[PDB]
Amino acid sequence: ALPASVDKQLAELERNANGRLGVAMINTGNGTKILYRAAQRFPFCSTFKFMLAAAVLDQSQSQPNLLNKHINYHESDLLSYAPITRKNLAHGMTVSELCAATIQYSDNTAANLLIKELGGLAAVNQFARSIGDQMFRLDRWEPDLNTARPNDPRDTTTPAAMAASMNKLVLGDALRPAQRSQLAVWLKGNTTGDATIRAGAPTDWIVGDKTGSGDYGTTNDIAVLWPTKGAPIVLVVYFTQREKDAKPRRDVLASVTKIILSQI
Numbered sequence: 578a579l580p581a582s583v584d585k586q587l588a589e590l591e592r593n594a595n596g597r598l599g600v601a602m603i604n605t606g607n608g609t610k611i612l613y614r615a616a617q618r619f620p621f622c623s624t625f626k627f628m629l630a631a632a633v634l635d636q637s638q639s640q641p642n643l644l645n646k647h648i649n650y651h652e653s654d655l656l657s658y659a660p661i662t663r664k665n666l667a668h669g670m671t672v673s674e675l676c677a678a679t680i681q682y683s684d685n686t687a688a689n690l691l692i693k694e695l696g697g698l699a700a701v702n703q704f705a706r707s708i709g710d711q712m713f714r715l716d717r718w719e720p721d722l723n724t725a726r727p728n729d730p731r732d733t734t735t736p737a738a739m740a741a742s743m744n745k746l747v748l749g750d751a752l753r754p755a756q757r758s759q760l761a762v763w764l765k766g767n768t769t770g771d772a773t774i775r776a777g778a779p780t781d782w783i784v785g786d787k788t789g790s791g792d793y794g795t796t797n798d799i800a801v802l803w804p805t806k807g808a809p810i811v812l813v814v815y816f817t818q819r820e821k822d823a824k825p826r827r828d829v830l831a832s833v834t835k836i837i838l839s840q841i
């Protein structure tokens with residue numbers, strides 16, 4: 578749904594910031610949703626890492642050993658944005674520790690290592706289809722999926738699909754309990770999210786999120802919010818802008834969050 582008061586606010590925000598905004602909020606206490614351009618495709622940038630970590634957790638359900646599998650990667654695997662895999666190069670990392678790094682620091686090497694571990698880009702896509710997500714499409718490895726080009730469907734999803742996937746995985750029954758638990762623990766320990774949905778939410782709430790950004794000033798954040806009263810809320814905000822070199826607008830995401838949460 579889309580209340581008139583939210584519609585006007587978001588449209589003004591979107592226009593003023595010369596961008597296109599995609600929003601999907603699911604309030605799991607009452608089942609109410611707020612949707613704005615929610616069925617349109619947006620470049621997901623690093624937010625895909627949530628779906629990747631979930632796919633690894635799903636794989637772990639039939640391989641109870643997998644999270645503790647030690648990966649001794651090498652310098653050739655290291656990318657420009659890889660702070661945690663860089664830190665642990667000498668000793669390697671477990672798959673669990675790779676999932677934590679790719680969620681909580683957006684480590685690009687950790688992502689590509691986990692894609693390889695799952696069996697390739699199409700394995701992530703098949704995982705998404707297995708939970709009913711028909712829109713998620715991962716087409717490139719890191720760091721090349723950040724091009725975020727106009728009307729390019731590679732490396733995109735819709736806000737509605739991502740929000741429904743986050744709901745099923747974190748708050749519903751798409752994963753077994755230990756796994757779903759683990760996915761939330763990773764999200765709540767995110768270190769990249771202070772300026773985005775967290776900045777728009779009450780200080781007393783707990784936010785677990787995954788950020789992403791890329792060219793075209795693309796600024797994204799997907800979160801589960803734990804309020805002081807009531808059930809958890811899913812919020813996905815995607816935003817992209819006119820020119821390739823536009824600067825990201827993390828404040829826009831914080832403002833979207835203020836607008837949406839005001840309605841709750």
Ligand SMILES: *C(=O)[C@@H]([C@@H]1N=C(C(=O)O)[C@H](SC2CN(C3=NCCS3)C2)[C@@H]1C)[C@@H](C)O
Nearest residue numbers: 622623624658683685720723769788789790
């Ligand atoms: C993911 O979007 C991107 C990864 N993940 C990132 C993220 O932290 O969510 C960074 S993007 C980097 C953070 N940036 C800025 N923050 C301060 C002002 S500019 C740009 C990292 C590169 C993938 C697509 O590579």
